[PDB]
Design a protein around this nucleic acid. Structure first.
Ligand SMILES: [Mg+2]
Length: 750
RNA sequence: CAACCCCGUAAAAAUACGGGGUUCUGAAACGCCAACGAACAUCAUGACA
RNA sequence: UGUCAUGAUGUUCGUUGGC
């Protein structure tokens, strides 16, 4: 009854609750808790790799006494390429203190050690009683800065509906009206209620008096109209309170679905008849003239609203760690992490509510209850939501631009050359003149590079992840260029062919010719072409647009490859994290042989377990015997050395680093999966990380790889055998057709 | 696109095929991705006391 | 050096398409 295929229901329930339950809601909740750590580990590993790539290799009192770790710290912190991370270590164009940077690095190391599983297994869930006094101060200072910032930025953006909401409520404090509207959209008091007000207003919208807001001419404003009726309702219930409670009891005591609608039906018609006049009065204020006039005056409101804000309120310590992680990333990664966390915590809240509804045990163990309950989860969900809602410009400072210039010219030519030549070209290109000034009327290269490479997120991603010394080789191999261009859809390909046409090519609508010419023009690009940017005649505009397009395409091509390789490696990191996690639950320790780790022992152990054989993924029954036989056959073709090497490769993210030594000999590309596995197989073959004495079938795999210049499916099936205990995961991670969910190709016939 | 469990007709094998489930299986779907759009902050251009 | 026009760059919202 509700048992899982992995046969860890009892173990998981005992670990998290303490006893076994005969129902199917507890594990339903536990999977979200298990989901949080996966994404946290992925992003922490990415951050650690970034720190390693950009910077080539008791309390604070003990640090000075060591005299050796002190030397490591003094030089590691002073390295000037800390400027590549925006606010991690520099504040107001000034360096942060050594204690704060030490605190940030130590917290990152502790989080990495926690996720990749000395710190206890309960570290993240108990920060009040484990964190030292020094780190808490640094987190507090960071949150003080950001809370001053959010106080500033809030009042400026949404000061168009704020005026109307303050106006519609004469008998209310200026502070109070702002309080609830921050309680409304920045952090949702909308969501945390048993009504579906979105559906409710639709039922109100079914009432006659307010069809007068459904006119076609009102299409100019919808979002700034839909929300306004939304906020009034969540303010209408707050004042009445008892009526809100009355509707709670009536719905909870309602019988059937027909009873649900009728309760909604009569409630809505009372609502329109109650305060419909406010809806008409509010909805009559929106127009082009009023909106423009309201935007003109943006300092008529002066509200601090500091006290109950978590900036001054005792914000949780778990959210400050998330903000510290956020400091060291870009927009997409932050959005991914925050969205996943909000979804998971919302699901946890809903599930615990469901458990309480049926009068069932819902308290966790004493170790976990301090964090996992209704109130603390609600608070931490609100904190994560407010962390997500921060506007960032991330302009590349004003001092860091010099190293930016150096690396920016290093990518566009001048690969692996001494800095003296770089400085010489810097001086000869854009002169200074006398007194360290800038030659007016003769500086156009600085503007082009600064506004097209320096201030681009793609360049920051490449600098964080790719070495500027050896980045040019990613575009030298034609096949990779054609594959990446073919991945890009049709419309912007057509736009790029049009803009960067030239004068010696005839118009063609064929996409193959377009890809060919784009590959040809992107193969040979140098800094010397960019030496004639028009200073300050349609030819000048056309030339400027063509230069913008050609510099954009290059970085796009590099960035796509880097991102997709990181993404595949993160998918494999999830797999190893889950494997290490599941090894502890099942109690099967991983011993060492010849200074290695045998990652293939979990599947061997589960191959000979009666309970797993009878009620698990690997089944030995008449009619259900595919994967048992296939896994048993594939287990006999695994190299322990190769598996250990693969584990190290994915742990260190070596595919992104050493991609310049093996991307020059690939035959043909059809998916990023085969590129990734060709790179890893080439690295393993060149490093001689195999043993033919213990397994003589690796020689044929290497020979096939050499004679075909493409990855061998048998080898990827070989070094992924530790994933044998989950059949869907093995299928997804070893079969190309099932790795990507955007490919409708069926599974190949065997 | 794949796995898992029920109810059907033939069958004993590495069982096909026809209906309904699954957050209690793995794939970012409360997500990515483009082009039209509205505000906003940036950088470069002409009119002036 | 503020203002008015004039074009580029990136976010943030919503429509419309595609995964
Ligand atoms: Mg799941």
């Amino acid at each position: 009854p509700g048992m899982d295929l992995l046969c860890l229901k009892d173990k998981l329930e005992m670990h998290y609750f303490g006893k076994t339950f005969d129902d199917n809601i507890h594990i339903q909740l536990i999977y979200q808790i298990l989901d949080i750590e996966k994404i946290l580990a992925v992003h922490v590993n990415n951050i650690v790799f970034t720190l390693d790539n950009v910077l080539h290799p008791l309390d604070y009192q003990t640090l000075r006494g060591q005299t050796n770790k002190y030397d490591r710290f003094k030089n590691y912190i002073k390295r000037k390429e800390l400027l590549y991370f925006g606010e991690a270590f520099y504040h107001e164009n000034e360096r942060r203190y050594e204690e704060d940077i030490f605190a940030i690095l130590t917290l990152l190391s502790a989080l990495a050690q926690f996720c990749f599983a000395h710190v206890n297994s309960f570290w993240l869930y108990q920060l009040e009683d484990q964190l030292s006094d020094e780190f808490k101060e640094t987190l507090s200072i960071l949150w003080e800065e950001v809370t001053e910032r959010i106080d500033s930025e809030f009042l400026k953006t949404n000061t168009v509906n704020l005026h109307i909401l303050c106006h519609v409520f004469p008998k209310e404090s200026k502070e109070t009206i702002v309080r609830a509207y921050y309680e409304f959209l920045i952090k949702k008091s909308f969501k945390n209620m048993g009504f579906s007000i979105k559906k409710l207003r639709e039922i109100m919208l079914e009432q006659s008096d307010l069809k007068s807001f459904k006119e076609d001419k009102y299409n100019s404003v919808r979002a700034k109209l839909y929300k306004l009726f939304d906020f009034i309702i969540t303010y209408y219930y707050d004042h009445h309170a008892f009526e809100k409670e009355a509707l709670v009891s009536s719905l909870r005591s309602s019988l059937t679905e027909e009873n649900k609608e009728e309760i909604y039906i009569k409630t809505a018609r009372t609502l329109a008849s109650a305060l419909g006049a406010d809806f008409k009065k509010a909805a009559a204020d929106v127009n082009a003239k009023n909106i423009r006039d309201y935007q003109k005056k943006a300092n008529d409101y002066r509200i601090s609203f500091e006290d109950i804000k978590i900036g001054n309120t005792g914000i949780g310590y778990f959210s400050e760690l998330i903000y510290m992680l956020t400091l060291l990333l870009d927009g997409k990664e932050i959005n991914d992490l925050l969205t996943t966390l909000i979804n998971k915590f919302d699901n946890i809240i809903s599930f615990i509510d469901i458990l309480k509804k049926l009068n069932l045990e819902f308290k966790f163990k004493p170790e976990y209850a301090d964090f996992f309950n209704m109130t603390n989860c609600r608070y931490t969900l609100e904190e994560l939501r407010v962390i997500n809602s921060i506007a960032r410009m991330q302009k590349p400072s004003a001092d860091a631009r010099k190293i930016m210039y150096r690396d920016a010219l290093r990518i566009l030519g001048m690969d692996n050359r001494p800095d003296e030549e770089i400085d010489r070209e810097l001086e000869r290109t854009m002169p200074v003149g006398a007194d360290g000034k800038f030659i007016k009327g003769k500086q156009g290269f600085r503007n082009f590079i600064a506004s097209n490479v320096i201030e681009s997120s793609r360049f920051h991603y490449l600098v964080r992840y790719n070495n500027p010394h050896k980045t040019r080789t990613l575009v030298k191999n034609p096949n990779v260029v054609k594959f990446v261009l073919e991945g890009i859809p049709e419309t912007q390909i057509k736009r790029y062919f049009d803009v960067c046409k030239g004068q010696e090519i005839p118009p063609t609508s064929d996409k193959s010719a377009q890809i060919d010419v784009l590959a040809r023009i992107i193969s040979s690009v140098d800094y010397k072409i960019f030496e004639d940017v028009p200073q300050s005649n349609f030819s000048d505009a056309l030339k400027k647009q063509r230069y913008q397009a050609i510099v954009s395409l290059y970085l796009t091509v590099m960035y796509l490859i880097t991102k997709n390789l990181v993404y595949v490696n993160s998918r494999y990191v999830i797999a190893f994290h889950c494997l290490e996690r599941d090894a502890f639950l099942h109690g099967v320790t991983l011993p060492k042989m010849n200074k290695k780790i045998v990652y293939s022992q979990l599947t061997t152990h589960l191959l000979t377990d009666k309970n797993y054989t009878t009620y698990g993924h690997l089944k030995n029954q008449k009619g259900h015997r595919k994967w048992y036989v296939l896994v048993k056959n594939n287990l006999q073709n695994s190299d322990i050395t190769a598996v250990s090497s693969f584990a190290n490769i994915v742990a260190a993210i070596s595919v992104v680093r050493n991609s310049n030594e093996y991307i020059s000999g690939i035959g043909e590309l059809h998916s990023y999966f085969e590129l990734y596995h060709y790179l890893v197989q080439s690295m393993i073959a060149k490093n001689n990380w195999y043993d033919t004495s213990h397994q003589p079938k690796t020689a044929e795999y290497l020979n096939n790889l050499k004679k075909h210049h493409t990855y061998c499916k048998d080898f990827v099936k070989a070094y992924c055998i530790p994933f044998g205990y989950v059949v869907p995961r093995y299928k997804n991670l070893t079969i190309n057709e099932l790795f990507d969910r955007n490919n409708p190709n069926p599974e190949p016939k065997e």
